[PDB]
Design a protein around this ligand. Structure first.
Ligand SMILES: NC(=O)c1ccc[n+]([C@@H]2O[C@H](COP(=O)([O-])OP(=O)(O)OC[C@H]3O[C@@H](n4cnc5c(N)ncnc54)[C@H](OP(=O)(O)O)[C@@H]3O)[C@@H](O)[C@H]2O)c1
Ligand SMILES: NC(=O)c1ccc[n+]([C@@H]2O[C@H](COP(=O)([O-])OP(=O)(O)OC[C@H]3O[C@@H](n4cnc5c(N)ncnc54)[C@H](OP(=O)(O)O)[C@@H]3O)[C@@H](O)[C@H]2O)c1
Lengths: 322, 325
């Protein structure tokens, strides 16, 4: 213990390369996140991924603080990520959103704060506000101004590092090229897996030393109406299953190891005590270059999470090629 | 930012972690041994957490002092230094393995090495001389079962003298030999071998990976080019045009490109320098990354150029470089 695999971010901080996802569908009791985070820590996860919009920060924080006070882990050995929801993109709303997250977590800082999604919605308690016609109440906010507000939260010490999520090439360039930029995003957390392996965006991120963090790396939560139930089940893939047999591992383990070997930090959500343990075994084997090539072949350009309910605004990120 | 107790490491097949950038400590004979002391100190100061040495480099006293010095002054803790030594070929006989380790520890004044390797698979006769020769200058080769040598290595690990054990300059056959040994207790955590864009070890790399063995690259910058070890007609790796082009593009150096290349193919890479500026420059390998096209462009430099043949040890069956890999 005490040591684990991390990568150096562009602001000098280190991020553990395997992250534990904490989102769980609405039907799942928020209490299950409490135990799942505790187990994840016990199993050796050192990186925990959440967001204000997952509505579990109370529980996630309790787990962390609970594996701390029981000396199972130290605060410096937990990399905790939160995310700014789209109803707080206005500059004067960013620090208050982070501070509310921190109050819920009862923590002094987050290790990483991301702009969760580049499209903005009307400020208020409702995370997906809708009008009388059932249409989204979008808002217009200069992301450059939101990013300047994140830089101030990092300078205030409330976030160790800042980054973004669901940003495309155009949106990343907007930040990277912003006049007077103080801090580049350390990461861009996006959907990534053998069926949507983000090779183009990945390479771009690499060229600017931005770490691409893969979510729904195991084929996603497949929650409706977010993900089409007709979409292929990743973990049933014939090639993944074959490689899983060869290595005597599982298709999940193969999908995770794949991301590690291509330079991607990978998240993995499970609320199963035993699967939580399985996933940490990603550090127990390697894939050969022929095998990597085989997984590369699986790419289909199928995106599980379109979030197309947010389509329309200029900053909707998935219309571009990448 | 956080020159903290955080840095990039990989998990070894025995549960231990190895920092992925190692500092090489061998310097040609014309270089005074004293220089190794200041070099390793500067390397620790710069952020190297992995230090590579060997009995045959005749600097363990200096390298050990450097490490002790940086611990005793509070710059670093012992658990944050990954120190590697190597068993020289005059101590391949099983009963001589632990005595060899203990002697290196005595010279270093350390309690344990983080990693102890079988340095080279060809054995020579026991005694003080590292390359024992008879009166006619013939090297005095010895016949030793490396499987027995490995058993003695396993015992060194069970004793806590070495946290991990591995090999160096082993080929496919020799690896299989160890891995397929009856009663095998500990697999080698690594195979430290020459590796660089002119000799990228693709095949051997895949093999190691398939066994979860970490390939550690030595002479990753094109070697010390010391004669008569290295053919002075050999190409200068760091003068390669492609490397130079990439270096220019990234605003880095050919050396940085060469090291980053290894990191991105899952290879732990060593880098030797006794120059304060280059020592600091090399840890910059964590500051950028290469695209898949750039990686492919480096893969294209492979030219089967082995800088270090060690062919004075060619002849005996265990000579490792005759086989395809
Ligand atoms: N920033 C964003 O826009 C965004 C979007 C989506 C997700 N995320 C983050 O990424 C995390 C992961 O994404 P996800 O939650 O969408 O999908 P995921 O991690 O792809 O989900 C994998 C599904 O596989 C199951 N699983 C886990 N380990 C397994 C194993 N070893 N073998 C077989 N099945 C296994 C899990 O079910 P069990 O619990 O029953 O094991 C889970 O439902 C989320 O929790 C969240 O933190 C971020
Ligand atoms: N196990 C084995 O059989 C074996 C064999 C050979 C080597 N090794 C290990 O691997 C280490 C490295 O191998 P090496 O010593 O053969 O080769 P190396 O690390 O490839 O040597 C690089 C040469 O490049 C120079 N250099 C370092 N950084 C540079 C930079 N940033 N820009 C330009 N030049 C730079 C150094 O000279 P300056 O010092 O002047 O900077 C050095 O002489 C050794 O010290 C040793 O620990 C092991």
């Amino acid at each position: 213990d005490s040591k684990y695999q991390c990568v150096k971010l562009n602001d000098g901080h280190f991020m553990p390369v395997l992250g534990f996802g904490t989102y769980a569908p609405a039907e799942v009791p928020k209490s299950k996140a409490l135990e799942a985070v505790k187990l994840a820590i016990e199993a050796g996860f050192h990186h925990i991924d959440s967001a204000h919009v997952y509505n579990n920060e109370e529980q996630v924080g309790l787990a962390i603080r609970s594996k701390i006070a029981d000396g199972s882990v130290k605060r410096e050995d937990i990399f905790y990520t939160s995310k700014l929801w789209s109803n707080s993109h206005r500059p004067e709303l960013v620090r208050p959103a982070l501070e509310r997250s921190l109050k819920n977590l009862q923590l002094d800082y987050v290790d990483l704060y991301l702009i969760h999604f580049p499209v903005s919605v009307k400020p208020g308690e409702e995370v997906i506000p809708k009008d009388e016609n059932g249409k989204i109440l979008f808002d217009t906010v200069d992301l450059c101004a939101t990013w300047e507000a994140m830089e101030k939260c990092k300078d205030a010490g409330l976030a160790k590092s800042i980054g973004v999520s669901n940003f495309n090439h155009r949106l990343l360039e907007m930040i990277l090229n912003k006049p007077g930029l103080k801090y580049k995003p350390v990461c861009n957390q996006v959907e990534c897996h053998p069926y949507f392996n983000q090779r183009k965006l990945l390479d771009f991120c690499k060229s600017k030393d931005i770490v691409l963090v893969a979510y729904s790396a195991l084929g996603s939560h497949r929650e409706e109406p977010w993900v089409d139930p007709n979409s292929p089940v990743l973990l049933e893939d014939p090639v993944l299953c074959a490689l899983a047999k060869k290595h005597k591992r599982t298709p999940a383990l193969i999908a995770l190891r794949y991301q590690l070997q291509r330079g991607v930090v990978v998240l993995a959500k499970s609320y199963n005590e035993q699967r939580i343990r399985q996933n940490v075994q990603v550090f127990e084997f390697q894939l050969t270059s022929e095998e990597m090539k085989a997984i590369d072949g699986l790419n289909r350009n199928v995106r599980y999470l379109t979030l197309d309910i947010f389509a329309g605004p200029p900053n909707y990120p998935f219309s571009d090629e990448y």
